[PDB]
Coordinates of C-alpha atoms and ligand atoms in Angstrom, one line a residue:
X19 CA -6.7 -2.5 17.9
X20 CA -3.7 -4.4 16.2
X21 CA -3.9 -8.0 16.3
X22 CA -2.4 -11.2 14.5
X23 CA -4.2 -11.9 11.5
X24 CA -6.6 -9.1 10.9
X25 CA -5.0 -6.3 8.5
X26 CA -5.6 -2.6 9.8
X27 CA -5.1 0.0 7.2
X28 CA -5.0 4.3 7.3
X29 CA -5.4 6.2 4.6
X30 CA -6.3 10.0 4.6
X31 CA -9.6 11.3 4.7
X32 CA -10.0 13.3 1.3
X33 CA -8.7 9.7 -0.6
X34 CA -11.2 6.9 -1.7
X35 CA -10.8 5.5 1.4
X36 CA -14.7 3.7 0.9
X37 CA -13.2 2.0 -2.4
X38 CA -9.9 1.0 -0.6
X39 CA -12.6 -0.8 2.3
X40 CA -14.0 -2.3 -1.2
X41 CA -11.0 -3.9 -1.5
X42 CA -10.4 -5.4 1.4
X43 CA -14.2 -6.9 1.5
X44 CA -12.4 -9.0 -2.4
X45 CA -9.3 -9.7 0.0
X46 CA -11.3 -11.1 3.5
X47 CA -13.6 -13.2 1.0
X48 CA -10.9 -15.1 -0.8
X49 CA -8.6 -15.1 2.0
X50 CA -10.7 -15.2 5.0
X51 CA -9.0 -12.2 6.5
X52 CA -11.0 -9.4 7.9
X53 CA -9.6 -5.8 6.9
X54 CA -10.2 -2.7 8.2
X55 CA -9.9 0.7 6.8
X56 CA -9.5 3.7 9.4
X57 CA -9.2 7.9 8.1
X58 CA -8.3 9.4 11.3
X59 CA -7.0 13.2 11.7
X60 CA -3.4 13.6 11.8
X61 CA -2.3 10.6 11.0
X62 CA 0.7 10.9 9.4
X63 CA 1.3 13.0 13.0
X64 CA 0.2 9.9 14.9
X65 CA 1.8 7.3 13.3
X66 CA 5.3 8.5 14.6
X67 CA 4.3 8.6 18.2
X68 CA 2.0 5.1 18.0
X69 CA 4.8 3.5 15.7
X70 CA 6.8 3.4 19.0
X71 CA 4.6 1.9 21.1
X72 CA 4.2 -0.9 18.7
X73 CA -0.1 -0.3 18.0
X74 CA -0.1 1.6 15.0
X75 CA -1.6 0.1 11.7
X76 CA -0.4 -2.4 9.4
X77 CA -0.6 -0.6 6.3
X78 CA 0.1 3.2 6.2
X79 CA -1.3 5.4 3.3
X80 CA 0.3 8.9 3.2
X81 CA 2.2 11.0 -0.1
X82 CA 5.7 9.8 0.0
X83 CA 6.8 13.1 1.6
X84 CA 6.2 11.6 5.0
X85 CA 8.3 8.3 4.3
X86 CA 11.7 9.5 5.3
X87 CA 11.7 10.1 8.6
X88 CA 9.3 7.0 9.3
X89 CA 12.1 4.5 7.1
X90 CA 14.9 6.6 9.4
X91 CA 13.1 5.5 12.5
X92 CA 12.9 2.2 11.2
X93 CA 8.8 2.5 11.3
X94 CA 8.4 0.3 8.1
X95 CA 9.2 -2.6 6.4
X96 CA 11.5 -3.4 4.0
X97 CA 9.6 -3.8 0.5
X98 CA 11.1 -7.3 -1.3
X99 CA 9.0 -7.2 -5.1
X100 CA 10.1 -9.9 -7.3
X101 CA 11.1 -7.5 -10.3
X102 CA 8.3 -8.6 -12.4
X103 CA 6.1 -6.7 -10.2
X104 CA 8.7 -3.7 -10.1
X105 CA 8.3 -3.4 -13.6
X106 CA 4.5 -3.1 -13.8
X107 CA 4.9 0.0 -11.7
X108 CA 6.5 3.2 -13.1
X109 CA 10.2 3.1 -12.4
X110 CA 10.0 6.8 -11.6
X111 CA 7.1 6.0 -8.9
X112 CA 9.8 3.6 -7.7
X113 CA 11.9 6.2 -6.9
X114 CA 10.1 8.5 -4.9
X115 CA 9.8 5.5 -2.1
X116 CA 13.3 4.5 -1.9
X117 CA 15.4 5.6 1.3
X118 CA 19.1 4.9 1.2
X119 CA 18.3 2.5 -1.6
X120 CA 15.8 0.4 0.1
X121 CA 12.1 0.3 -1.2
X122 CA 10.0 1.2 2.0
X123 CA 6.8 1.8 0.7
X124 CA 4.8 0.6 -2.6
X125 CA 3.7 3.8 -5.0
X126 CA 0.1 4.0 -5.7
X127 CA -0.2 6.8 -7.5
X128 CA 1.1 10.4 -8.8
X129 CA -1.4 13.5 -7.4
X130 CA -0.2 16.8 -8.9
X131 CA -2.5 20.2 -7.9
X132 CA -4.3 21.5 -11.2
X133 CA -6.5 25.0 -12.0
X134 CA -10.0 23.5 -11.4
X135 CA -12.9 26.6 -13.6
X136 CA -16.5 26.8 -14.1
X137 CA -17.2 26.8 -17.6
X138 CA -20.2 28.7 -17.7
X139 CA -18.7 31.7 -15.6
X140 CA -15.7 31.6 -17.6
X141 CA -15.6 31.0 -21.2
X142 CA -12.0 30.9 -21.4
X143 CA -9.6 30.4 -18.1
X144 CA -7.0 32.7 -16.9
X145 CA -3.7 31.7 -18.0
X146 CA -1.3 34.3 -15.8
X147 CA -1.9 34.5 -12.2
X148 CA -1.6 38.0 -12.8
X149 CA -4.9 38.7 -14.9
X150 CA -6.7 37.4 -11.8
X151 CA -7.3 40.4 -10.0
X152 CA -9.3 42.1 -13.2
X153 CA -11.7 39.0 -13.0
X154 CA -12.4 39.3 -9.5
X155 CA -13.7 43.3 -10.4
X156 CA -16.2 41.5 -13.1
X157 CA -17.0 38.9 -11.0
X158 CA -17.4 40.9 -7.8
X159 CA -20.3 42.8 -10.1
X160 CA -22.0 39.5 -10.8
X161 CA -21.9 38.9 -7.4
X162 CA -19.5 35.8 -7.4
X163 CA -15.3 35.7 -6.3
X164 CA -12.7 34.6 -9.2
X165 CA -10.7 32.3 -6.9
X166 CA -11.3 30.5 -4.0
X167 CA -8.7 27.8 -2.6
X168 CA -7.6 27.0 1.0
X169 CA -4.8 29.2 2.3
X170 CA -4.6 27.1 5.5
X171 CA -2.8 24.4 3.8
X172 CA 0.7 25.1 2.0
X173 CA 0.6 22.4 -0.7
X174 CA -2.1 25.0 -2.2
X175 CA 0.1 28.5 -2.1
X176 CA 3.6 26.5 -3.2
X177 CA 3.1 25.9 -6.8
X178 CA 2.8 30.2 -7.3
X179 CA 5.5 30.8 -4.3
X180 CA 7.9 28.2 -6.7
X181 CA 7.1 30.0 -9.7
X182 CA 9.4 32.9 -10.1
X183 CA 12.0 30.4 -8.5
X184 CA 11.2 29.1 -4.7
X185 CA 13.0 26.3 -3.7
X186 CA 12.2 23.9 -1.1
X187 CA 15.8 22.7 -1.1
X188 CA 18.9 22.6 -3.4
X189 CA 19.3 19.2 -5.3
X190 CA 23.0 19.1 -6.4
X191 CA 25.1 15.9 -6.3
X192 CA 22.0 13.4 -6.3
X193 CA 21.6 14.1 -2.7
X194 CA 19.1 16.9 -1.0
X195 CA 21.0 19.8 0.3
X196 CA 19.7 20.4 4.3
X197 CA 22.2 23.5 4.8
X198 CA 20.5 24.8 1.6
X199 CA 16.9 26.4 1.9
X200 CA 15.1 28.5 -0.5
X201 CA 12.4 30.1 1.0
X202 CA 13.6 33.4 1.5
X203 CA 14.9 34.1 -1.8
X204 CA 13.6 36.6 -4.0
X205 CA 11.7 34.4 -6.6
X206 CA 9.6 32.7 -3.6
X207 CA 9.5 36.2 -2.1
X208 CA 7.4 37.4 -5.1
X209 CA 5.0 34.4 -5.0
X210 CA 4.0 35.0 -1.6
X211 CA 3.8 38.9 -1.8
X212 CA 1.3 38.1 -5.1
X213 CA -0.9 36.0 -2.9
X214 CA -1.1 38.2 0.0
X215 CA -1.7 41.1 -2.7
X216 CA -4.8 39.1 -3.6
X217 CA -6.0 39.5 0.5
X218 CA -4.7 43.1 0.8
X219 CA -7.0 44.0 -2.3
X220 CA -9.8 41.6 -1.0
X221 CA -9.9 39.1 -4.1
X222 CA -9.1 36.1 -1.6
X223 CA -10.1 36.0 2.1
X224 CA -7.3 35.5 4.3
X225 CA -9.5 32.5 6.4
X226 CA -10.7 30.1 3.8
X227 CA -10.2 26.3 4.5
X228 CA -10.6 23.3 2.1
X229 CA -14.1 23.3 3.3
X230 CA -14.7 27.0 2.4
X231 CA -13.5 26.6 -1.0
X232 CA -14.5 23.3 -2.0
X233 CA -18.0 24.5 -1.1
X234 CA -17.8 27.6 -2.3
X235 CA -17.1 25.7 -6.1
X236 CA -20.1 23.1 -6.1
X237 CA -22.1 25.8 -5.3
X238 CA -21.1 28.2 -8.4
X239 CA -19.8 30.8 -5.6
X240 CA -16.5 31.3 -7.2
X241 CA -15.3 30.4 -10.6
X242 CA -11.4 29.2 -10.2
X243 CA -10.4 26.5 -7.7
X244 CA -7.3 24.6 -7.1
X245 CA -7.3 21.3 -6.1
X246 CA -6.4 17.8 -6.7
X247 CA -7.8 14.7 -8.4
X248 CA -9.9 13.2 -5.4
X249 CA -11.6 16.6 -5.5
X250 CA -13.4 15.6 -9.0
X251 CA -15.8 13.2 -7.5
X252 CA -17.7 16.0 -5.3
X253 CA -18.0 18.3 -8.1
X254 CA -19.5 15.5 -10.5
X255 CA -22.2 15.2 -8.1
X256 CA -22.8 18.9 -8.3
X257 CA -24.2 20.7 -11.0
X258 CA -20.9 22.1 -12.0
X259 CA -19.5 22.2 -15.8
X260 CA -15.8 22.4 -14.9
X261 CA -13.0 22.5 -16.9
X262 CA -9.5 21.2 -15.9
X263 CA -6.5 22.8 -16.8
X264 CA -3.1 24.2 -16.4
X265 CA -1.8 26.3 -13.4
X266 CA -1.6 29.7 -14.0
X267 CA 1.6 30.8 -14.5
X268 CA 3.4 33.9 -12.3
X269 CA 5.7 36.5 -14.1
X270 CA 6.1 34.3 -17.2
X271 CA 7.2 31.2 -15.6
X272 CA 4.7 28.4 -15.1
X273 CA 3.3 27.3 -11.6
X274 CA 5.8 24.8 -10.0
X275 CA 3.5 22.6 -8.2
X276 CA 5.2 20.0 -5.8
X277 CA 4.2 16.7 -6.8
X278 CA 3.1 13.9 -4.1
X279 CA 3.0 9.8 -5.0
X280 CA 0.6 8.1 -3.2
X281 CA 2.3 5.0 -1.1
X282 CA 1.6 2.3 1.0
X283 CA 3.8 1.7 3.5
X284 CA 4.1 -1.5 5.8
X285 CA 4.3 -1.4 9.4
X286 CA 7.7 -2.9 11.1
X287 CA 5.7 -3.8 13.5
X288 CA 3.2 -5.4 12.2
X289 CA 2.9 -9.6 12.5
X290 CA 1.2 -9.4 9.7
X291 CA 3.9 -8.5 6.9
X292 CA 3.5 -11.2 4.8
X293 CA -0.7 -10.4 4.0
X294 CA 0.2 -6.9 3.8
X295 CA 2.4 -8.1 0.8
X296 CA 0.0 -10.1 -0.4
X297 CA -3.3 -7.9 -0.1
X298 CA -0.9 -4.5 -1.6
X299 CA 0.6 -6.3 -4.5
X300 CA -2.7 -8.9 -5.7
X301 CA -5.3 -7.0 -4.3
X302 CA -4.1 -3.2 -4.2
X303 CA -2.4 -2.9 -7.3
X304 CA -3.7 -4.5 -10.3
X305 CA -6.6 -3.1 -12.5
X306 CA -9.6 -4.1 -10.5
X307 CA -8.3 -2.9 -7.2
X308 CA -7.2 0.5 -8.7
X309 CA -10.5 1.0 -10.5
X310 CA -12.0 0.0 -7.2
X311 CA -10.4 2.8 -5.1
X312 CA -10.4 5.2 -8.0
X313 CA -14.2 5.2 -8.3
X314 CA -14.7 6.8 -4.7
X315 CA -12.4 9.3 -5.2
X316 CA -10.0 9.8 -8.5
X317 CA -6.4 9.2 -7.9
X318 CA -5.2 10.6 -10.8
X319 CA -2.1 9.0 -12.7
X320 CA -1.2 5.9 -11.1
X321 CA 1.6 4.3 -10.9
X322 CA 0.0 0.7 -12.4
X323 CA 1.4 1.1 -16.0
X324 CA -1.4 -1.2 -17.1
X325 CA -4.2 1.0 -15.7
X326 CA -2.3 3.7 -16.6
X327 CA -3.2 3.9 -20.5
X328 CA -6.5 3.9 -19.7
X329 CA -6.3 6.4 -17.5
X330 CA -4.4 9.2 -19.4
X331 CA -7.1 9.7 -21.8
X332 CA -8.9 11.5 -19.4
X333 CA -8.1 15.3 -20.5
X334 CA -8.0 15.5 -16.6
X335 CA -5.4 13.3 -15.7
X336 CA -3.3 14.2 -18.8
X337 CA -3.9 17.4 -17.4
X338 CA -2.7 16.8 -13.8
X339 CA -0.2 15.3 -16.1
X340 CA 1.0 18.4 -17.6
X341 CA 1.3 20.1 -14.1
X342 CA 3.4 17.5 -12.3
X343 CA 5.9 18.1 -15.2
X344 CA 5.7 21.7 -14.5
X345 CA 6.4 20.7 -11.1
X346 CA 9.3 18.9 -8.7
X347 CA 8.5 16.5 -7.2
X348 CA 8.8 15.9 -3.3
X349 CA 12.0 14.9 -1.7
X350 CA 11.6 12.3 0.9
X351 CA 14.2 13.5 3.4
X352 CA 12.8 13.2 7.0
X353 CA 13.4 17.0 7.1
X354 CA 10.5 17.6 5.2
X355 CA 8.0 17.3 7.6
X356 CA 9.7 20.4 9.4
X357 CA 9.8 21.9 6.1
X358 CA 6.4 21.9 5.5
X359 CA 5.2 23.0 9.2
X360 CA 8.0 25.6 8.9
X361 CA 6.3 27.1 6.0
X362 CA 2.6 26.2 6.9
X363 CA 2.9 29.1 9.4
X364 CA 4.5 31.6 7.4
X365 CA 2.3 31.4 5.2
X366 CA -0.7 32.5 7.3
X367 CA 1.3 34.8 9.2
X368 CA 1.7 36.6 5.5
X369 CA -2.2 35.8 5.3
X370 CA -3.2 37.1 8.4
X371 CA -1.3 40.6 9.4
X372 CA 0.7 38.7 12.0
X373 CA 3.9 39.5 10.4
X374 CA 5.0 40.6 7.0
X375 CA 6.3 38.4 3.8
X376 CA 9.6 38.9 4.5
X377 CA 9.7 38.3 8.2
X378 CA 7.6 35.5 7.4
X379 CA 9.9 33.4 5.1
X380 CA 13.0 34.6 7.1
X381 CA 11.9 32.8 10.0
X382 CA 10.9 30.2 7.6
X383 CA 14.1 29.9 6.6
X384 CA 15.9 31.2 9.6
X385 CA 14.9 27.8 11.1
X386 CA 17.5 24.8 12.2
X387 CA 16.7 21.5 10.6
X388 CA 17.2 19.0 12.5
X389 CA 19.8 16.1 11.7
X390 CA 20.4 12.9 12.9
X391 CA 23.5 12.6 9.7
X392 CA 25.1 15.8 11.4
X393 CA 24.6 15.0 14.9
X394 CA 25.7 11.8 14.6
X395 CA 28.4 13.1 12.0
X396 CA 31.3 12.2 14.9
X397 CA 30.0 8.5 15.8
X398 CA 31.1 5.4 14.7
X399 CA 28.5 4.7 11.6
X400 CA 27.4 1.1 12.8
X401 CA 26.3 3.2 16.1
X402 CA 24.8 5.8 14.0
X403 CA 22.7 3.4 12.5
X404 CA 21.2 2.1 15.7
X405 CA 21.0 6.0 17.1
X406 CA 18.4 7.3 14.1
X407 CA 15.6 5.7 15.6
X408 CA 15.4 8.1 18.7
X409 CA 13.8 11.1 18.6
X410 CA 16.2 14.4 17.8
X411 CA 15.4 15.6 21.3
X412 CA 16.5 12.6 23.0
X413 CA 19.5 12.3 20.4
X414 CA 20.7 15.1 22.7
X415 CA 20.9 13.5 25.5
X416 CA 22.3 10.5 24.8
X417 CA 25.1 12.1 23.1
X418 CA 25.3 14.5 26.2
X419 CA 25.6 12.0 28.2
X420 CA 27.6 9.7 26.0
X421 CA 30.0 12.0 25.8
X422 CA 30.7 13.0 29.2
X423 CA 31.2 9.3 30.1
X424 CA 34.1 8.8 27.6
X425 CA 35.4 12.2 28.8
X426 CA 35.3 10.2 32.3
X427 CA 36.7 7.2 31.6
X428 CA 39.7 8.7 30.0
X429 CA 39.5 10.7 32.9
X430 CA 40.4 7.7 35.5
X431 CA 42.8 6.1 32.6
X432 CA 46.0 8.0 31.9
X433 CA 47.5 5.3 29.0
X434 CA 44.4 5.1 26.9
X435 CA 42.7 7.8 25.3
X436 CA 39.5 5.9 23.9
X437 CA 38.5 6.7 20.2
X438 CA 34.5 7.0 19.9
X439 CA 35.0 4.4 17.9
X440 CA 36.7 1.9 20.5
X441 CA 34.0 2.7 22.7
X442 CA 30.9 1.8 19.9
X443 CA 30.3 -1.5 21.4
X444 CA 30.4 -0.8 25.0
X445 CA 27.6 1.8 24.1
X446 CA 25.5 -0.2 21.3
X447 CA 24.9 -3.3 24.5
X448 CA 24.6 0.0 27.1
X449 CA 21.7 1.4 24.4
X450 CA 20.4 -1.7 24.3
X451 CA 20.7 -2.9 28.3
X452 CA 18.8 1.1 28.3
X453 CA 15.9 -0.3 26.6
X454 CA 15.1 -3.3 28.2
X455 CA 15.2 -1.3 31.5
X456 CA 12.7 1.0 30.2
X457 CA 10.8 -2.2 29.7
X458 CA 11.4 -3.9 33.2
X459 CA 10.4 -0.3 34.4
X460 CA 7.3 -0.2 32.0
X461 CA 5.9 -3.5 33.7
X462 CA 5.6 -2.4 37.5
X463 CA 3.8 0.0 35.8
X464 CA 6.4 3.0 36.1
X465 CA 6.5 4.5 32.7
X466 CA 10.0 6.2 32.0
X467 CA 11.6 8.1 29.2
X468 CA 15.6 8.4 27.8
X469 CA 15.8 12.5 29.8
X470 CA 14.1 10.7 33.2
X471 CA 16.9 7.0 32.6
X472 CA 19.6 9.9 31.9
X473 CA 21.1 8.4 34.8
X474 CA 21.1 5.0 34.5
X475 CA 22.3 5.0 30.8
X476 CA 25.5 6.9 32.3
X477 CA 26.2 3.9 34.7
X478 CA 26.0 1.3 32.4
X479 CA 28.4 2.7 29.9
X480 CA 30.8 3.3 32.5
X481 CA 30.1 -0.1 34.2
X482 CA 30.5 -1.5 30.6
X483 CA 33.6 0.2 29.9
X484 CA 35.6 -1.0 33.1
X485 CA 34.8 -4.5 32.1
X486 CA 36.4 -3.9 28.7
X487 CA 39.3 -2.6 30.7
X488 CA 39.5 -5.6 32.8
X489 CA 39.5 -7.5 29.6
X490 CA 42.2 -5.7 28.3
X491 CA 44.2 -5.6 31.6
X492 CA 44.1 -9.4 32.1
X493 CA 44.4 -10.0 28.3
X494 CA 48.3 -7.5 28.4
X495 CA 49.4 -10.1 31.6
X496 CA 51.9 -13.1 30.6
Ligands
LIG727 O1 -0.5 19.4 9.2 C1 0.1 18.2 9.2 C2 1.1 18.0 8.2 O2 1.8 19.3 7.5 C3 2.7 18.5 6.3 O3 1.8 17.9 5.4 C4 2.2 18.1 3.9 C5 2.2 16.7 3.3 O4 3.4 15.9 3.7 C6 2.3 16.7 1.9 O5 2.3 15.3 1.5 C7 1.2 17.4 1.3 O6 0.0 16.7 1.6 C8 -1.1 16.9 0.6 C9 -1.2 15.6 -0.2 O7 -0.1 15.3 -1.1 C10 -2.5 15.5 -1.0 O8 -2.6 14.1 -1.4 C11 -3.7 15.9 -0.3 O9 -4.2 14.8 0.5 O10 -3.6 17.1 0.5 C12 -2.3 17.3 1.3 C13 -2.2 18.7 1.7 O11 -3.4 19.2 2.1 O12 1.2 18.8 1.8 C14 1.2 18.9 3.3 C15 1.4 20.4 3.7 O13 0.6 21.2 3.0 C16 3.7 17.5 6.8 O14 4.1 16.5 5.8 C17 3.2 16.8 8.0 O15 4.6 16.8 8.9 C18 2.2 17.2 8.9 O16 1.6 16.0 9.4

């Protein structure tokens, strides 16, 4: 539940989310408010839908990835750090969070996907993704797999699908390019075709999860894993001598990993935005704190410059270091959501036999991102604004329906053809005189969406419009 004065944070499962509750136990004693830290499954899928309602969490922990479309929708807060506290943070950190230069989230930390060996099983790791196969042969013998690493997810298969030159999108002009995909082209092409040659040839199987492969590690199973920082605590309990190093690299070219910063948003929501200011800023990110999550499960590089120096020492971070420079990091555009599912599935249909490669990535890129910027593209911008919160679908049929009722209205009124833009405020108070209907109708206990009000939104911009008409009829009279 989400109530005044008790904080309520998410935070994905594989995280240190038992340090982060750490935290909040040095917060609720010196402050006297409780916190409570939640890891449910798909959360970064639920907070869009619960966001809405109003009863999602105060604080949202998710890569910054996921932060676009959430600060489009208006989800989250507006981040206002004194700039003393901007500049203990990276000022690259800074910049993965920002949506149409506003801070919406805090960065935590910088995660970047690393070549996890065994150092007993391999004296020396591989350093082409090519030289791979030839282990598996020897290790096959010995009765153990060269790689094992979760095919289900495709964070894992994009650093080698990037390699040879996959492209998530085109960057040019300081702004993210959503006509521009590179999935499908011939560098990405190769990637993918590599990987499924490994479960062609049987060196990878085509169904292995995080589970799988994780266990499959701390067991001495397989000797190569790839993985991220808050994977190192599970293997320190194990037995394991690992080793922690660079990404192979495909055709000559070094793994491209994508690289994800850890951020805490705020809920807009939320009554509570001025303790989850407080408990993210003199709680969260300062030394203690960080050392505090970081002990459950590693974060990697952080984004605390002070706890940073410490931190890089660790061969393991200045190695996940040395990949995230190899690597891009991830745009924030609400498209990438729909990016990522988009790929997810070609993927495993190239895994599974369900379609070939390059079927596979053409559909991936075949696909229609959706965009509020180019529907909207027509629209008075001060509408536009209001208009990104709705969901694509219902976008639709508002403009739909919008549309026809200008189309109407100039209809019954030969001297004035309307510009969209004449109209904006007849339609921002009709929007708005929408949602408080939905409201009235929501007590009463009738629960109606924008497709089931289609109607009534028609009306009301019609009504709204004749009244303006009025206005200007009386207003022309001596
Ligand atoms: O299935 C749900 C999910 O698919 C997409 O998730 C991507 C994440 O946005 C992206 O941040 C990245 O997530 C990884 C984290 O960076 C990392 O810290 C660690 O926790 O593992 C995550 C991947 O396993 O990659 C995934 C896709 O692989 C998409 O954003 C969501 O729309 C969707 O909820």
């Amino acid at each position: 539940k989400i109530e005044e004065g008790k904080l309520v944070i998410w935070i994905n499962g594989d995280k240190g989310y038992n340090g982060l509750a750490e935290v909040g136990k040095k917060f609720e004693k010196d402050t006297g408010i409780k916190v409570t830290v939640e890891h449910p499954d798909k959360l970064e899928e639920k907070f869009p839908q619960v966001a809405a309602t109003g009863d999602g969490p105060d604080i949202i922990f998710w890569a910054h990835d996921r932060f676009g479309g959430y600060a489009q929708s208006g989800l989250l807060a507006e981040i206002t750090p004194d700039k003393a506290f901007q500049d203990k943070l990276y000022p690259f950190t800074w910049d993965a969070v920002r949506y149409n230069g506003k801070l919406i989230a805090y960065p935590i930390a910088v995660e970047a996907l690393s070549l996890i060996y065994n150092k007993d099983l391999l004296p020396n790791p591989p350093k082409t993704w090519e030289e791979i196969p030839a282990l598996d042969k020897e290790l096959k013998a010995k009765g153990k797999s060269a790689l094992m690493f979760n095919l289900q997810e495709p964070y894992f298969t994009w650093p080698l699908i990037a390699a040879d030159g996959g492209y998530a999108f085109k960057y040019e002009n300081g702004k993210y390019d959503i006509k521009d995909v590179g999935v499908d082209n011939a560098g990405a092409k190769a990637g993918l075709t590599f990987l499924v040659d490994l479960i062609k040839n049987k060196h990878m199987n085509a169904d292995t999860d995080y589970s799988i492969a994780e266990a499959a590690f701390n067991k001495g199973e397989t000797a190569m894993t790839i993985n991220g920082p808050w994977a190192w605590s599970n293997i320190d309990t194990s037995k394991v001598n690992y080793g922690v190093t660079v990404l192979p690299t495909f055709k000559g070219q070094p793994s491209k990993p994508f690289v994800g910063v850890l951020s805490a948003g705020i809920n807009a929501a939320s009554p509570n935005k001025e303790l989850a200011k407080e408990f993210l800023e003199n709680y969260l990110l300062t030394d203690e704190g960080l050392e505090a999550v970081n002990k459950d499960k590693p974060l990697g590089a952080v984004a605390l410059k002070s706890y940073e120096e410490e931190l890089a020492k660790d061969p393991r971070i200045a190695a996940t270091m040395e990949n995230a420079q190899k690597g891009e990091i991830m745009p924030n555009i609400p498209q990438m959501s729909a990016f990522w599912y988009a790929v997810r599935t070609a993927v495993i249909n190239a895994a599974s036999g369900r379609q070939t490669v390059d079927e596979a990535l053409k559909d991936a890129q075949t696909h229609n991102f959706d965009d509020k910027e180019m529907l909207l593209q027509e629209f008075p911008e001060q509408l536009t604004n209001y208009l990104l919160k709705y969901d694509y679908r219902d976008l639709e049929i508002i403009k739909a329906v919008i549309l026809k009722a200008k189309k109407s209205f100039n209809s019954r009124h030969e001297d004035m053809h309307y510009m969209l833009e004449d109209i904006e405020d007849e339609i921002l108070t009709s929007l708005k005189r929408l949602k408080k209907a939905i409201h009235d109708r929501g007590v009463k206990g009738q629960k109606e969406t924008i497709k089931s009000m289609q109607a009534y939104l028609m009306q009301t911009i019609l009504t709204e419009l004749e009244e303006t008409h009025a206005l200007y009829m009386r207003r022309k009279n001596m």
